[PDB]
Amino acid sequence: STPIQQLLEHFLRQLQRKDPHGFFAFPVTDAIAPGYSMIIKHPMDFGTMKDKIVANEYKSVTEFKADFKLMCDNAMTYNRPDTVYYKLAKKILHAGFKMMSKERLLALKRSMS
Ligand SMILES: COc1cc(-c2cn(C)c(=O)c3cnccc23)c(OC)cc1CN(C)C
């Protein structure tokens, strides 16, 4: 494991704690959510992100944050605001962007000196 892989695994584990039922653990299928593929053209989930960390597919934290935001944006686009999925995606998005904020990353950058 590389220092980037270790850091991204840490960020991912903390995010996955917010989804205990595993709604974001694997890709959403049309069987589980009718007409999902008709609406969502760029699917994303924690499991896909996990495989990208393991395969060393993330060159930056920015790229990781973009996949995370995409996963939350998809759930907020497909599901209506009064749903469990939309509410959880908005909660997860807020938790991820405070944890991986520019301030938290600048403090990390400074500690790498
Ligand atoms: C009802 O349980 C599930 C829900 C979803 C689910 C997720 N998201 C993100 C959605 O937007 C969504 C929207 N509509 C319907 C369902 C979902 C799921 O997708 C991987 C898997 C399960 C199966 N479960 C045993 C883990």
Swiss-Prot record:
Q: Which cysteines are joined by disulfide bonds?
A: none
* Bromo domain mapped to chain residues: 1-101
Q: List site positions: Histone H4K5ac H4K8ac and histone H4K5bu H4K8bu binding.
A: I32, Y85
Location(s), subcellular: Nucleus
Q: Where is this region: Histone H4K5ac H4K8ac and histone H4K5bu H4K8bu binding?
A: 77-79
Domains: entry comment: The Bromo domain mediates interaction with histones that have acetylated lysine residues at specific positions. Also recognizes and binds histones that are butyrylated.
Q: What does this protein do?
A: Plays a role in chromatin remodeling and regulation of transcription. Acts as a chromatin reader that recognizes and binds acylated histones: binds histones that are acetylated and/or butyrylated. Component of SWI/SNF chromatin remodeling subcomplex GBAF that carries out key enzymatic activities, changing chromatin structure by altering DNA-histone contacts within a nucleosome in an ATP-dependent manner. Also orchestrates the RAD51-RAD54 complex formation and thereby plays a role in homologous recombination (HR).
- Assembly: Binds acetylated histones H3 and H4. Binds butyrylated histone H4. Component of the multiprotein chromatin-remodeling subcomplex SWI/SNF called GBAF, which includes at least BICRA or BICRAL (mutually exclusive), BRD9, SS18, the core BAF subunits, SMARCA2/BRM, SMARCA4/BRG1/BAF190A, ACTL6A/BAF53, SMARCC1/BAF155, and SMARCD1/BAF60A. Interacts (via N-terminal bromodomain) with acetylated RAD54. Interacts (via C-terminus) with RAD51.
Task: Supply the name of the protein.
Answer: Bromodomain-containing protein 9
What is the native source organism of this protein? Homo sapiens (Human)
- Give me the gene this protein comes from: BRD9
Which portion of the entire protein is included? 138 to 238 of 597
